[PDB]
Amino acid sequence: AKDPFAHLPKSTFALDEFKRKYSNEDTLSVALPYFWEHFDKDGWSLWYSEYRFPEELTQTFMSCNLITGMFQRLDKLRKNAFASVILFGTNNSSSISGVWVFRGQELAFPLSPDWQVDYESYTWRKLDPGSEETQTLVREYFSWEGAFQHVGKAFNQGKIFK
């Protein structure tokens, strides 16, 4: 009665390795190609979110703290999941968006009511690792260089769920 991704076999792809080159290297041609060659689309999955209640946001300094407060509940989760959550906009109209990774068919939150607090106010959808959009969104959320025009806010403050 611990670790939801313990029913699964050997983990092919190595999240904790990827997390180094992700920021240690030129991800655009380092982590990106090393992620898009042989991901693990049988087991890992990508989950886009855009904080479905961005009305709840009304500063900048606080939202970075808020995102992270979630991550401190999800502290027994990061051991088999990651995300690149970004705070956008400003006080006047902020938003949180980002893409998360969880190691099963589900987003991990439903795999344990340990992690079913305020998550409902955020969207969570699986997407295809050979779409067009997912590949762009990932590149933007992972490089921070992308364009973020799909948000149309501004990038202000990134956060990582490592």
From Swiss-Prot:
EF-1-gamma C-terminal domain span: 1-162
Cross-link (Glycyl lysine isopeptide (Lys-Gly) (interchain with G-Cter in SUMO2)): 10
Residues that bear N6-acetyllysine: 126, 159
Tissue expression as described in the entry: Highly expressed in pancreatic tumor tissue and to a lesser extent in normal kidney, intestine, pancreas, stomach, lung, brain, spleen and liver.
Induction of its expression: Down-regulated in response to enterovirus 71 (EV71) infection.
Domain of life: Eukaryota
Modified residues (N6-malonyllysine): 159
Role summary: Probably plays a role in anchoring the complex to other cellular components.
Record note on quaternary structure: EF-1 is composed of four subunits: alpha, beta, delta, and gamma.
Name this polypeptide is given: Elongation factor 1-gamma
Species of the source: Homo sapiens
Phylogenetic placement of the source organism: Eukaryota, Metazoa, Chordata, Craniata, Vertebrata
Parent-protein start and end of this portion: 276 to 437 of 437
